[PDB]
Design an enzyme around this catalytic site. Structure first.
Site, PDB file in Angstrom:
ATOM      1  N   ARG A 173       0.815  -1.184   0.000  1.00 29.25           N
ATOM      2  CA  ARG A 173       0.000   0.000   0.000  1.00 29.25           C
ATOM      3  C   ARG A 173       0.853   1.241   0.000  1.00 29.25           C
ATOM      4  O   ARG A 173       1.390   1.550   1.013  1.00 29.25           O
ATOM      5  CB  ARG A 173      -0.912   0.000   1.197  1.00 29.25           C
ATOM      6  CG  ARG A 173      -2.151   0.846   1.080  1.00 29.25           C
ATOM      7  CD  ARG A 173      -1.915   2.312   1.123  1.00 29.25           C
ATOM      8  NE  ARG A 173      -1.458   2.770   2.399  1.00 29.25           N
ATOM      9  CZ  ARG A 173      -1.452   4.029   2.791  1.00 29.25           C
ATOM     10  NH1 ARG A 173      -1.901   4.999   2.034  1.00 29.25           N
ATOM     11  NH2 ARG A 173      -1.001   4.308   3.965  1.00 29.25           N
ATOM     12  N   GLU A 225      -3.348   5.604  -1.692  1.00 28.69           N
ATOM     13  CA  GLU A 225      -4.393   6.448  -1.139  1.00 28.69           C
ATOM     14  C   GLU A 225      -4.350   7.826  -1.789  1.00 28.69           C
ATOM     15  O   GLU A 225      -3.416   8.601  -1.575  1.00 28.69           O
ATOM     16  CB  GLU A 225      -4.249   6.571   0.374  1.00 28.69           C
ATOM     17  CG  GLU A 225      -5.247   7.524   1.019  1.00 28.69           C
ATOM     18  CD  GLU A 225      -4.975   7.735   2.496  1.00 28.69           C
ATOM     19  OE1 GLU A 225      -4.020   7.119   3.019  1.00 28.69           O
ATOM     20  OE2 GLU A 225      -5.713   8.525   3.128  1.00 28.69           O
ATOM     21  N   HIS A 256      -7.686   5.277   8.630  1.00 21.30           N
ATOM     22  CA  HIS A 256      -6.797   6.102   9.454  1.00 21.30           C
ATOM     23  C   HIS A 256      -6.900   7.603   9.184  1.00 21.30           C
ATOM     24  O   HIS A 256      -6.425   8.405   9.983  1.00 21.30           O
ATOM     25  CB  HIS A 256      -5.341   5.662   9.251  1.00 21.30           C
ATOM     26  CG  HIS A 256      -4.869   5.789   7.836  1.00 21.30           C
ATOM     27  ND1 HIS A 256      -5.361   5.002   6.814  1.00 21.30           N
ATOM     28  CD2 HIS A 256      -3.962   6.616   7.264  1.00 21.30           C
ATOM     29  CE1 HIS A 256      -4.770   5.333   5.681  1.00 21.30           C
ATOM     30  NE2 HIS A 256      -3.918   6.313   5.925  1.00 21.30           N
ATOM     31  N   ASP A 257      -7.503   7.987   8.061  1.00 22.43           N
ATOM     32  CA  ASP A 257      -7.578   9.403   7.698  1.00 22.43           C
ATOM     33  C   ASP A 257      -9.005   9.950   7.672  1.00 22.43           C
ATOM     34  O   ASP A 257      -9.250  11.008   7.101  1.00 22.43           O
ATOM     35  CB  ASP A 257      -6.924   9.640   6.331  1.00 22.43           C
ATOM     36  CG  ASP A 257      -5.404   9.654   6.402  1.00 22.43           C
ATOM     37  OD1 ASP A 257      -4.848  10.005   7.463  1.00 22.43           O
ATOM     38  OD2 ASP A 257      -4.762   9.308   5.390  1.00 22.43           O
ATOM     39  N   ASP A 314       2.121   4.916   0.306  1.00 20.24           N
ATOM     40  CA  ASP A 314       1.781   6.177   0.935  1.00 20.24           C
ATOM     41  C   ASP A 314       2.025   7.357  -0.011  1.00 20.24           C
ATOM     42  O   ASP A 314       3.005   7.376  -0.765  1.00 20.24           O
ATOM     43  CB  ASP A 314       2.587   6.347   2.225  1.00 20.24           C
ATOM     44  CG  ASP A 314       2.482   7.747   2.800  1.00 20.24           C
ATOM     45  OD1 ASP A 314       1.409   8.101   3.339  1.00 20.24           O
ATOM     46  OD2 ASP A 314       3.485   8.491   2.717  1.00 20.24           O
TER      47      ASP A 314
END
Ligand SMILES: [Ca+2]
Ligand SMILES: [Ca+2]
Length: 687
Positions: free
Chosen positions: A227, A258, A328-329, A229
Site C-alpha cells: 500500500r 491512497e 486512518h484518515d 503512501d
C-alpha cells in the site's frame, strides 16, 4: 493453487482486508516498547507509542480473533525503521508510532519487532490463509528543517545502517530543496515537501536503485501486497516505472495507493492514476458516499447507486477498488451515542459489493473518535460477540465461495429513498442484497425480479440484521415480502460453471515476459489457450492451468491496451478482461524538459511520441498538462515519464488549448533511453 488461495499475491477481490495501525492493536511484547517521552503508559497522548507490535498481531491470529472473523488479509503500518526522536508539534510530543517517518527502509522498526518477528508474522498469517499487506512510503523520510539541522533527525536516510545522507548538507542530492507544499496544485504537492517531510528526489538514480532494492527485501520475506503512501505526491511516471519493475521481478504483488477525495467529489487525475499507473486505489468515491447514506443520512439510496454506476464508468479495473467505510484518515464511522445498525449495514454492503473490501481495526467494536489522532485509539476490546463481528464472519467467506461476489457485475433491482436491492452476477452464480436504512419503517417489496434460479433462499445473515427468506419463481419473480426496519439480507446461488469465465487479471500492466494471473471459473483442468487480443499464448507460454486460475507469460505483442481472453482445451471461448496495458519492455523514468515553449493563458504544453508509453502520437493521449513552476520555470516545461529502457524514442511537444492543437515544427526530437537508470532529456521547442 486456486484463485482463492493465500498464494495468490496478485489478485485480492476474493479477500477481506483488515487494516491494522500496528502500535494501536495489541502489545504482544512489552520488551520492545519505547520508553520515556516516546511512550504513553497511560495512553493519554495519542501521538506517542502505545506499544502495539507484530507479536500482538500474531497472537490475535493464533487465538482466533482475526481468523474467526473471516478476514483473509492484514494491512499493516510501514514495517521499516523509523526515527526514534520525539518532536514537539504544536505543544505536544509526537513520535513515529504511525510508521510514516522512515529512516532506513531496509531495517525494521524495533518497536514492532525484529526481522525474525516479521518473518514469524508472515508465516503465521500464511499458515492461517491470511495475506499480508504493508504500507510503503518512498515519498519521504522524516521531518526536517531547512534552517535547523538539529530539528528531529534532519530527515536522515540510512542504507542498512550506513548513512546515505541527510536533508541539511545533502551532498549526494537525495532530497528536493523547494520548501513545503501548499497543496495548491498537484505539481506543487509532488516536488515540494509534504509538510516538513524531507522529500525524496526520485530523479536521482541512487534513490531509484535504493527503493527498488528495499522493496525487493520485503517482498523476499513473503509480503503479498503493497500500500503506497502519498501517491499524489510522487510523479505518476516514477510510480508506474517502479511497479512495472516489481511486476517484471520475482514477486508480482497487488499494489494500491491512497488518493484522498472529499464527499461528493470526483477527480480526473485520481481516475487516470488508477487506470494507468499500474497501481490501484482506495475507493474514496464509494467510501464517502456510503458514509453519506448510512452514517450521516445526507444522500439517498438512489444517490448511492448513481455513484456505483459512475465509478463503473470511470475506473477500468473495477474489481481492484479497495472499498471501506472509514480508515486512518477519516472520522470513525461510529458516532458516539448513535445506534450500531449503520455500521452493520455499511459493512454488509462493502462485503458484498465489487472490489477489495478493507475494514479498519475496531470497526467491529464500534470504536469512536473524530479527527487525527482520535481515530487511532487503542483497540478497545476483542469481544467476538458483537453483531458487527458476526456480520463480517457470515459474509466475508462469500468472497471466497461465491464468484458473483468476488467478480460479478452489479445491477440495481430495486430502489427507494431508504431501500436498495443490488444483484451481483458472474456466470451461473448470483447474489442478491437488500438494505433498508430506515430504523423506524418497514417497506413492502412488490414485483421484485432476480437472476436467482427458482427456489427458497434463506438469508446468509440468518436474520441477524432483521433479514428474511425469499421465494423465487421460475421466471425470476420474487414473492412479495416486507423488508423490515433496519433490514439487511443476502441471498445467493453458486453453480458449477461449464463455460470459461474470467473474473480478474493481475497485474493490469506488464511488459512481455511478465507473468500474469488470470482468475475465474470454468477454465477446466487441462491447459488450453490464452489470448492477448488475437495473439495466441500456448504451451511454454502457459505457466500453469487449473479450473479457477491460469498463470501465463505476456507474449511479444504490440504495446498498448488490449483484451485478455481464454479458450479451454475443448475450444470453448471466454469473456474478456479489457484494457490490460502491455508495456514495450522494462521501464525507466525519464524527465522530459522542453525550453522556450511559450503559450497563451488556457494553453498548455504536452508530450507525445511514437512509443505506447508516449501515447503513440495520439494528441488526446498526450502526456500532460506538463509542469512549469518547480523543477523548471515557464517558458520551460517538464514531466517525469515511464518509458521503455534502452529504446530510441521519437517525440514532439504540442500545445493544446481551447480545442486547438499546435504541433512542434521540424523533425521529431530523438533520444535513446538508459538501459537501467532513470534519466533526463532536455530539448528546445522547435518553431
Ligand atoms: Ca510492544
Ligand atoms: Ca514528493
Amino acid at each position: 493453487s486456486p484463485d482463492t488461495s493465500v498464494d495468490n499475491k496478485v489478485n485480492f477481490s476474493t479477500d477481506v482486508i483488515y487494516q491494522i495501525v500496528t502500535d494501536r492493536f495489541a502489545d504482544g511484547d512489552r520488551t520492545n516498547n519505547p520508553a520515556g517521552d516516546a511512550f504513553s503508559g497511560d495512553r493519554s497522548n495519542l501521538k506517542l507509542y502505545f506499544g502495539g507490535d507484530w507479536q500482538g498481531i500474531i497472537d490475535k491470529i493464533n487465538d482466533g480473533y482475526l481468523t474467526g472473523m473471516g478476514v483473509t488479509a492484514l494491512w499493516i503500518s510501514q514495517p521499516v525503521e523509523n526515527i526514534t526522536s520525539v518532536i514537539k508539534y504544536s505543544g505536544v510530543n509526537n513520535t513515529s508510532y504511525h510508521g510514516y517517518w522512515a529512516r532506513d527502509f531496509k531495517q525494521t522498526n524495533d518497536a514492532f519487532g525484529d526481522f525474525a518477528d516479521f518473518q514469524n508474522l508472515i508465516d503465521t498469517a500464511h499458515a492461517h490463509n491470511i495475506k499480508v499487506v504493508i504500507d510503503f512510503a518512498p515519498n519521504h523520510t522524516s521531518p526536517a528543517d531547512r534552517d535547523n539541522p538539529g530539528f528531529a533527525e534532519n530527515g536522515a536516510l540510512y542504507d542498512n545502517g550506513s548513512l546515505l545522507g541527510a536533508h541539511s548538507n545533502d551532498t549526494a542530492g537525495l532530497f528536493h530543496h523547494n520548501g513545503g507544499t501548499d497543496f495548491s496544485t498537484i505539481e506543487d504537492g509532488i516536488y515540494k515537501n509534504l509538510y516538513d517531510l524531507a522529500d525524496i528526489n526520485h530523479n536521482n538514480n541512487a534513490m531509484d536503485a535504493y527503493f527498488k532494492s528495499a522493496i525487493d527485501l520485503w517482498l523476499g520475506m513473503g509480503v503479498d501486497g503493497i500500500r503506497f503512501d502519498a501517491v499524489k505526491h510522487m510523479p505518476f511516471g516514477w510510480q508506474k516505472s517502479f511497479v512495472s519493475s516489481i511486476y517484471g521481478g520475482d514477486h508480482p504483488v497487488f499494489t494500491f495507493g491512497e488518493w484522498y477525495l472529499g464527499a461528493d467529489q470526483t477527480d480526473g487525475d485520481n481516475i487516470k492514476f488508477a487506470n494507468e499507473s499500474g497501481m490501484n486505489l482506495l475507493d474514496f468515491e464509494y467510501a464517502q458516499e456510503v458514509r453519506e447514506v448510512f452514517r450521516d443520512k445526507t444522500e439517498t439510496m438512489k444517490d448511492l447507486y448513481e455513484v456505483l454506476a459512475s465509478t463503473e464508468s470511470q475506473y477500468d479495473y473495477i474489481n481492484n477498488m479497495v472499498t471501506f467505510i472509514d480508515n486512518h484518515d477519516m472520522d470513525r464511522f461510529q458516532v458516539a451515542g448513535s445506534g450500531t445498525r449503520a455500521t452493520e449495514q455499511a459493512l454488509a454492503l462493502t462485503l458484498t459489493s465489487r472490489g477489495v473490501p478493507a475494514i479498519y481495526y475496531g470497526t467491529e467494536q464500534y470504536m469512536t473518535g473524530d479527527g487525527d489522532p482520535n481515530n487511532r485509539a487503542m483497540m478497545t476490546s476483542f469481544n467476538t460477540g458483537t453483531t458487527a463481528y458476526k456480520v463480517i464472519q457470515a459474509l466475508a467467506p462469500l468472497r471466497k465461495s461465491n464468484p458473483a461476489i468476488a467478480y460479478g457485475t452489479t445491477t440495481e433491482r430495486w430502489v427507494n429513498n431508504d431501500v436498495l436491492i443490488i444483484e451481483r452476477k458472474f456466470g451461473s452464480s448470483a447474489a442478491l442484497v437488500a438494505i433498508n436504512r430506515n430504523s423506524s419503517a418497514a417497506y413492502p417489496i412488490s414485483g421484485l425480479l432476480s437472476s436467482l434460479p427458482a427456489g427458497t433462499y434463506s438469508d446468509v445473515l440468518n436474520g441477524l440484521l432483521n433479514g428474511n427468506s425469499i421465494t423465487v419463481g421460475s421466471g425470476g419473480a420474487t414473492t412479495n415480502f416486507t423488508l423490515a426496519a433496519g433490514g439487511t439480507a443476502v441471498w445467493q446461488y453458486t453453480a458449477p460453471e461449464t463455460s470459461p469465465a474470467i473474473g480478474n487479471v493481475g497485474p493490469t500492466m506488464g511488459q512481455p515476459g511478465n507473468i500474469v494471473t488470470i482468475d475465474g471459473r470454468g477454465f477446466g483442468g487441462t491447459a488450453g489457450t490464452v489470448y492477448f487480443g488475437t495473439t495466441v499464448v500456448t504451451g511454454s507460454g502457459i505457466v500453469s492451468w487449473e479450473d479457477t486460475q491460469i498463470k501465463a507469460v505476456i507474449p511479444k505483442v504490440a504495446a498498448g491496451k488490449t483484451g485478455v481472453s481464454v479458450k479451454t482445451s475443448s475450444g470453448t471461448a471466454s469473456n474478456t478482461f479489457k484494457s490490460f496495458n502491455v508495456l514495450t519492455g522494462d521501464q525507466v523514468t525519464m524527465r522530459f524538459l522542453v525550453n522556450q515553449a511559450n503559450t497563451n493563458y488556457g494553453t498548455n504544453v504536452y508530450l507525445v511520441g511514437n512509443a505506447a508509453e508516449l501515447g503513440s502520437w495520439d494528441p488526446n493521449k498526450a502526456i500532460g498538462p506538463m509542469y512549469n513552476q518547480v523543477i523548471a520555470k515557464y517558458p520551460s516545461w517538464y514531466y517525469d515519464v515511464s518509458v521503455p529502457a534502452g529504446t530510441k524514442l521519437d517525440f514532439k511537444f504540442i500545445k493544446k488549448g481551447g480545442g486547438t492543437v499546435t504541433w512542434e515544427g521540424g523533425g521529431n526530437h530523438t533520444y535513446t533511453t538508459p538501459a537501467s537508470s532513470v534519466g533526463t532529456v532536455t530539448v528546445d521547442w522547435q518553431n
